[model samples]
Target: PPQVNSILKANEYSFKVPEFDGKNVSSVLGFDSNQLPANAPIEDRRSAATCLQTRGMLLGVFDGHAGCACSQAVSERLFYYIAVSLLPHETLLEIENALLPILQWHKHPNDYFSKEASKLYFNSLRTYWQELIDIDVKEALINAFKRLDNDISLEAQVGDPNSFLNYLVLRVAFSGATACVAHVDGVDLHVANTGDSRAMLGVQEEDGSWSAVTLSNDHNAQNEREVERLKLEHPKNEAKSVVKQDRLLGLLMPFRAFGDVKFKWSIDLQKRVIEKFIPPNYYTPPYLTAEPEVTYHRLRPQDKFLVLATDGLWETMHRQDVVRIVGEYLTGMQNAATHLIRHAVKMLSLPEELARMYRDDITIIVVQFNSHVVGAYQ
Candidate 1:
């Protein structure tokens, strides 16, 4: 019992909304998040925070491939990028001179921030805001995704002055990550997704049955449009080669993602810096992108909660099944994410020898809504 409890409870974390003068200030009441590792060091990362400069709570799940470097960087850096994008111009100027008290971070102890690259990250963010002094939340989300990815590439190319940071930047650039971020401002909710991680809205019917409303689309081989878009982007000769064997260039699985300079960089550039050779059919470079497909939803009273998770969870569970488990388990003392993951692990019923090879690192965040606050808006 101790072993089971210790393993399941170790990474569980919860956050409650901070009230102002005993009044609710956000549509999000609070959230529960946790991670289960199938890898020696888990590659999935999650983040949550409330914006002091704007009206919203931001939560995201990032799944890393090859290694966790890119995911780690994005997890620490993305909320700040989104916060900067949402700020007014004068605030941007103030941020440029000195950082704003913008994001009130709700981070798990295991969710780390790198002191080594903080200034490097800060200068890049400064450059982004200097240019953005910019757009609606949707455009802001798009710009932030693209800009951050651009900076990832640039940082690797330019090389850091410090030795560790230089290696760190290269690692982040070489690895890849998929992101699903949800920003809730009052009744308005936006989901920005890149790669296979997903976001779903849990809605309750009058009959008390739960419905799964998918908020993000998977950007992998299964998505026909995504497949077509990549083929169309490259030359006609490369059509057969671009998405062979249901994999990007017959290698990477996600069609869109952050970092993975192997997929995004020029062959010459890769050879120059990476010390690694290029893949087959590497012609007409920059095959991958970090552009997110963003979905906007207006939360209604029946909308109970939102679930953001990495593919590790989705790989084993159907969306409807995932929603039902969380909905029924919403009755919490034990965390909803912890319960959901425990159920998933139980469903596997695999032996210890077989489990490690089979399981992917799972990460989840469940953001519960304040129905009464949402009803007041109506």
Candidate 2:
């Protein structure tokens, strides 16, 4: 009753963009987000922010496996890497000369960064941008994903002087996470997906019909191209075992992801670090990557809202149903994400213990659009 309702609502949060001079300055009106946990510590993370150094808003969802460390780090750090990549040479120098707040974060009370490693993260990010003092949003997005993943690998190899930081890096590297990020600048929408997490657009017809437009692909065994790509990356001998039981090397779910040095690092490095039993016939090194497949879309007046969620929501609810539920809720409604989560919970009708067994941590972000503002674009 009250207890179930209270627990479900605890993590729900909503944000409305501030209007300027009685005019909506952003195509995004606001957004609602919530997370319901299946894992004790919750492995899914969500982040949203407006870039102070550029003209865009960034929202992302990260799904972690093995542990929450990698997802947590990606949730906190990826956006900054993206913002830095979007900056011009002058802005990059200005920030490098003196570190600056590059993002106006829209965070729930629960979202946080590791105080111990902020400087280390920044220094690495600065080094990345300095080399960049030389980028397009799509290209910047690709580089940021690859660079951050590289940093995650490097930090683990180098090891930190501080004991906790060292352990943290190790934890982050051994684990893995999938990332789905959306960047909105005016009518320009770009979605970068690393694994199975998704970004779907809600579109409404003139006759009041609602439809789902998938903006990113699931980089897992289910996608034939992904399976084909995996086979091509390795030797012919590996073709049969490359994706055993529909999993990467029959160990991991998402074929593309961040961290998971066990899959990305050389076999020797895997042995040196906290290692898992290497998969059978795992001859080729670097079976996984954080390279995101990005999709660019020009927004239209009919595009009602966008949904960025972890696999939890998609696995349980189809995109069409999700769009319908959120679309109907938007017509009424803090709480599009909450409303959606409520349906998923109610649909399953499971007790707490069974719920934990059957479901993953469900994290959702429903970004509403300002149709009037989007329409104003010439």
The most accurate candidate by lDDT is 2
Residues 1-378, candidate 1, lDDT per residue (tens digit)? 626878788999999887878998567889999999887678999999889989888999999998999999999898888988899888778777764598888988888899889999988988888787645999989988988999999999999778888899999998999999999999999999999999999998988898999999899899999999998998899999999889999998888899999988877788889633556678898999999999999999999999999988999898999899999988441888998888778233443545568888899999999898998899
Model 2, span 199-257: residue lDDT tens: 99999988888999999999988899999999999999999988998898988899899
What TM-score against the true fold does each predicted structure earn? 0.95, 0.96
Global CA lDDT of candidate 1, please? 0.89
**42 Cα displacement, candidate 1 (Å):** 0.6
Q: What's the residue-level lDDT of 318 in candidate 1? A: 88
